[PDB]
């Protein structure tokens, strides 16, 4: 959990509009969020992991224990239940809400941090370099 720690800066995207229409965000509100470029700050206060994202249109932050479900409000403002576990090198997050599901894998790949999001075959890939 050392090689995730740090501030991260978005350098490529792929299908983030598609993924978002799948999670069900509105046309207008989907475009404006798609403009902005979130970063990703990841800290480790003792054993409580904090992941912040400092995008333009909305800032967000979550704090959790690895493998303990918790509640969050995601940037698109869904109220979800989610759990995050260090799964075979990656930091995998499941989010369950209104009978639906999605997975956010965060693996290191080279000096980068790759993020696969999937909701029913529809999958999006953002990439980050250490800022």
């Amino acid at each position, epitope marked *: 959990c050392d090689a995730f720690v740090g501030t991260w*800066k*978005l*350098v*490529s*995207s792929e299908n983030f509009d598609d993924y978002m229409k799948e999670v069900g965000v509105g046309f207008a509100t989907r475009k404006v969020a798609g*403009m*902005a*470029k979130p*970063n990703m700050i990841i800290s480790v206060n003792g054993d409580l992991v904090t992941i912040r994202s*400092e995008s*333009t*249109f909305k800032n967000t932050e979550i704090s959790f224990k690895l493998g303990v479900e918790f509640d969050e409000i995601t940037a698109d403002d869904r109220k979800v239940k989610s759990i995050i576990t260090l799964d075979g090198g990656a930091l995998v997050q499941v989010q369950k809400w209104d009978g639906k599901s999605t997975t956010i894998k965060r693996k290191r790949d080279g000096d980068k941090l790759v993020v696969e999001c999937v909701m029913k075959g529809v999958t999006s890939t953002r990439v980050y*370099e250490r*800022a």
Partner: antibody, heavy 120, light 113 residues
Framework: QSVEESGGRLVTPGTPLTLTCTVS????????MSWVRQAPGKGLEWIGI?????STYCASWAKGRFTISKASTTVDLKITSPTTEDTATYFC?????????????????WGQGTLVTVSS | DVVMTQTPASVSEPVGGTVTIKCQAS??????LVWYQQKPGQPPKRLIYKASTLASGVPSRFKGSGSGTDFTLTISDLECDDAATYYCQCTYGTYAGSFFYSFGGGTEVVVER
């Protein structure tokens, strides 16, 4: 703690030209370097940056016309086929980060510029 | 291939007064934006980086604001010394196989007296 350009002179259109930044007080295996140009009475144009690993990006318009190599303690900008548009003062500069050794806080160190004049 | 757009091109203001210049990025670039001052013949000096952080030994009369696409430098207590031409630069680096280090077209400040 210092960089300095040299090699600017009069060339005729077409003949290649090499400018040279020379550094002192830091290592090129730690720091990025970049070249910026400014024609007289005009704006700053960013040419391209060179990473400590030797990798290189150039502005969109620069591709084809410039090239940036580095050595021990020099960084060279090769202008490949000068045109009269390429007449300008060529600064050399050093990007850093929040303290040092990156690029996101922009340029903290410049040379005084070397004037290139292209004309027959 | 990002492009920065300063306004206004020129502006005059009396000593002790206040100016406001503005930058607009064509894309979102987060808070990665630096402001330079250039006096004629000299190379530029870095004033403000990270959109709002003050570089070493720069007076707080200089206030950098903005985020995402629209930033503003603001100079108060305008001193005679502040007469120069101010450039804004995108310092976000890599994005999508490109590199984003472009300068603003520049804004000249005239200090009336």
């Amino acid at each position: 703690q210092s960089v300095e350009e040299s090699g600017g002179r009069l060339v005729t259109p077409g003949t290649p030209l090499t400018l040279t930044c020379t550094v002192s007080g830091f290592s090129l295996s730690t720091y990025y370097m970049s070249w910026v140009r400014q024609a007289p009475g005009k704006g700053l144009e960013w040419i391209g940056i060179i990473y400590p690993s030797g990798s290189t990006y150039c502005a969109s318009w620069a591709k084809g016309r410039f090239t940036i190599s580095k050595a021990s303690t020099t960084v060279d900008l090769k202008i490949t086929s000068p045109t009269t548009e390429d007449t300008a003062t060529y600064f050399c500069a050093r990007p850093d980060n929040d303290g040092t050794s990156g690029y996101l806080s922009g340029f903290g160190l410049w040379g005084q510029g070397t004037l290139v004049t292209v004309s027959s | 291939d990002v492009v920065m757009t300063q306004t206004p091109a020129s502006v005059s203001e009396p000593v002790g007064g206040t100016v406001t210049i503005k930058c607009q990025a064509s894309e979102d670039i987060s808070r990665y934006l630096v402001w330079y001052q250039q006096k004629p013949g000299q190379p530029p000096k870095r004033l403000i980086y990270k959109a709002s952080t003050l570089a070493s030994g720069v007076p707080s009369r200089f206030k950098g604001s903005g985020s995402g696409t629209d930033f503003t430098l603001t100079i108060s207590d305008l001193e005679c010394d502040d007469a120069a031409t101010y450039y804004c630069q995108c310092t976000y680096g890599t994005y999508a196989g490109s590199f984003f280090y472009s300068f603003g077209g520049g804004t000249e400040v005239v200090v009336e007296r």
